[PDB]
Structures are given as structure tokens and as C-alpha cells.
Amino acid sequence: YTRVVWCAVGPEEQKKCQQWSQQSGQNVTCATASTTDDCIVLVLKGEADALNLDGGYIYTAGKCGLVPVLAENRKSSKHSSLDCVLRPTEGYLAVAVVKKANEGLTWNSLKDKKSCHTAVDRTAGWNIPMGLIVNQTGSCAFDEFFSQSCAPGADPKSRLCALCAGDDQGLDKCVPNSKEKYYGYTGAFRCLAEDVGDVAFVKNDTVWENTNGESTADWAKNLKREDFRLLCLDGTRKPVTEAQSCHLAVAPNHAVVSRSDRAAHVEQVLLHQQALFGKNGKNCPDKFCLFKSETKNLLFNDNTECLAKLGGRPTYEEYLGTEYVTAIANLKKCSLEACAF
């Protein structure tokens, strides 16, 4: 059935998509929206087929009837010569990161500091750290906990957007797409590295990928792992090598979602597209790589080894788990079941 329309979020994902579209022979084409929620509406209307989503957005989409199709999978220590496509996903570690030089900042003294978040509604950037903090303060006024924030996706006039920079020209401040300089895993870690915020809520991988030479980006060239600490829930501070034992939670991997009636077809095309543009793919290193965009995580995370079949044919609830779903239900109370569209 066998053409797929991919939904790109913002102009740089559009660029990368049009490139993929060309190389694929128009087997994949591109719709673009300004936000993930908008791409979710395109999918429901049937005007696009699929896009890859963080867990907090798999929640939104799943209430509207969309279904997990294929999950991002990275380099697992355990689970050895099992083919990547069939290997269970591990999850990723959500962490809070601070500068070592900012002595005496711990989980217990976050109040009134400056924070950097991936975007409103994302797992490691928003849902986990704010669900914890609402639980802890027994208060729904998360908008008043940090003194200033960059939380792309909140009111550009509020203090939740005060730290956001916008694009090259200072436009589009606090849009939840990669035009916002501090958007996403990479933008929130940048927000911290340049000392705009005191704390970044990212995942474990982000600190490694942008330190000790792994990046090459001008802001990240000189960043050293030993210059950062993770904040643990018991009040302590650990080197970034201790994430197994100092994280806020383990997150379900980003996954491709589609409308249930398109799922089989979307799944077939993507297995064949990764055969060509994935890690060992026929055409990757030389014509086109799907999982590469210079640390920008465009369409897919740059560390993705493959897209993996699911097994258990899970619903979105089962995919996310009862642990994670009740956390979001509870947090959403502050802002009991319906498609928000």
C-alpha cells in the first residue's frame, strides 16, 4: 500500500526528511508541522502516516487511538548476538544533571533555582521530574517551583519560558521544535553547559554524547564529564559514571506510532528502509544514514542502532507500563480519560 508519509516537526526535520524522501525513491514522503501535537493531528486525519515519539507523547497519541509500531533500540551490553530487530528494548535513564562547580546544589535544594527541560510533556524532561516534585511538595503549582526555566511548549510569556532563546534571529522563543536553541535532549544540556540554568533534566546518554570530544559542536568542544554531577533522589551527588544507581526513573524507549489501520503497512516499509539506511545498511555510510544528524537527533535519536519489532503486540498502555502511565495520569490532574483533541 506501499508509500508512507512521514511527519516532520519543524524545518530541520523537514530538511532531513526531504533528503530521505529523495533517496527512498519517494517510497517515503514528508508532511511538516510546527509541533509534535500537530503532527499527531495530521496522523489522525490520515494526512500523514507515522512519526517517532518520546513516551510522554505516546500517551497523548494513544488516548487518541494511535498505536506503537516499532521502537528505537541502542547498543545493549546484555542480550548479545540476538539480532537488533528482535532484541527487547532496555529503556533509558532519566537523570538530573548539574555543574560540579555549583557546590551544595542537591535534589533537596532545587527550589528557586533555574531549570532546563527538553519540552513540556516529555518523559525525562518534564513528566518524571515534575511528577516527582508535585508529589513531594504536595502542590500543583509546578509553574512556581523554579524561579526561571526553559520548558519549550509552555507560555512564552511565563517564567517557564524565561530561559529560552529562540532561533538565530531571536524568533520562535520557546517553540517545542529544534528552532528553539534549548529544545530537546541536546538543547537542555546546552542550556546547562552555557550556565543559563542550574539543572538539566535529560537522559544518561546525553551527557556522554556531548562531552570529552564526542560532539564537535562549538559549545560542546571543551566540555569534560568530570565537570558534571547527577543528582540522586536520596539527597546525594554522583559522577556521571554512576547513573545505574543515581537516576530519577527508567523511561520507555521512543517508538514509531501510526493509526492502527496503517500499522502493518507502516511497519513493513520501515523494516525495508532500515535495511537500506540503518547502521550496517546497504546505503548508509555512503548515500544516506537515517540515524545520523550531527548530534541533533532529527527524526530519530542519533544513537539508535535499529528500529525493533515489539512482541506482545502491545497496546500503548502496555508499551509504556502501569508504573509510567499512573505517574502521567496523576501529574495531568494538575493541568479522567479522553483524546485531548
Ligand X SMILES: *[C@@H]1O[C@H](CO)[C@@H](O[C@@H]2O[C@H](CO)[C@@H](O[C@@H]3O[C@H](CO)[C@@H](O)[C@H](O)[C@@H]3O)[C@H](O)[C@H]2NC(C)=O)[C@H](O)[C@H]1NC(C)=O
Ligand Y SMILES: *[C@@H]1O[C@H](CO)[C@@H](O[C@@H]2O[C@H](CO)[C@@H](O)[C@H](O)[C@H]2NC(C)=O)[C@H](O)[C@H]1NC(C)=O
Shorter beta-carbon distance to ligand Y: residue 180 or 205: 205
DSSP letters for 172-228? STT-SSTTSTT-HHHHHHHHHHTTS-SEEEEEHHHHHHTSTTS---TTTTT--GGGE
What character string, x for contact with ligand X (CB under 6 A) and - otherwise, covers 265-304?
Answer: ----------------------------------------
Shorter beta-carbon distance to ligand Y: residue 175 or 207: 207
Residue entry with cell 565537570: 227
Which residues have C-beta within 8 Å of that of residue 121, sequence separation ≥ 6? 56, 57, 60, 127, 153
Q: Among residues 2, 244, 322, 335, which is the contact residue for ligand IBP, using CB under 6 A? A: 322
Given a contact cutoff of 8 angstroms between Cβ atoms, the answer to whether 201 and 94 are in contact is: yes
If one counts every other C-beta atom within 10 angstroms of the C-beta of residue 302, the result is 17
Task: From 21-29, 129-137, 227-235, 314-322, give the range in contact with ligand Y by CB under 6 A.
Answer: 21-29
Shorter beta-carbon distance to Zn ion: residue 138 or 312: 312
Residue 322 found at the interface with ligand X (CB under 6 A)? yes
Chain residues 297-336 in contact with Zn ion, contact rule CB under 5 A = 312, 318
DSSP letters for 13-36? HHHHHHHHHHHTTSSEEEEEESSH
Residue 304 found at the interface with ligand IBP (CB under 6 A)? no
Task: From 46-54, 82-90, 211-219, 293-301, give the range in contact with Fe ion by CB under 5 A.
Answer: 46-54
Q: Which does 244 bind (CB under 5 to 8 A by kind): ligand X, ligand Y, Fe ion, none?
A: ligand Y
Residue 209 found at the interface with Fe ion (CB under 5 A)? no
Shorter beta-carbon distance to Fe ion: residue 54 or 172: 54
> 278 is written with which cell numbers?
540503518
Distance CA 332, CA 87 (A): 33
Distance CA 8, CA 258 (A): 14
Chain residues 222-251 in contact with ligand IBP, contact rule CB under 6 A = 250
Query: Among residues 152, 129, 115, which one has the least CA distance to residue 36?
Result: 152
Shorter beta-carbon distance to ligand X: residue 8 or 133: 133
E strand or H helix at 330, and its extent?
A: helix 322-332
In angstroms, what is the minimal distance from the CB of 224 to ligand Y? 13
Q: Among residues 14, 123, 204, 295, which is the contact residue for ligand Y, using CB under 6 A? A: 204
Q: Which residues are annotated as a binding site for hydrogencarbonate?
A: 118, 122, 124-125
Shorter beta-carbon distance to ligand X: residue 166 or 321: 321
Query: Among residues 213, 216, 234, 232, which one has the least CA distance to residue 224?
Result: 213
The footprint of ligand X (CB under 6 A) covers: 131-132, 135, 322-323, 326-327, 330
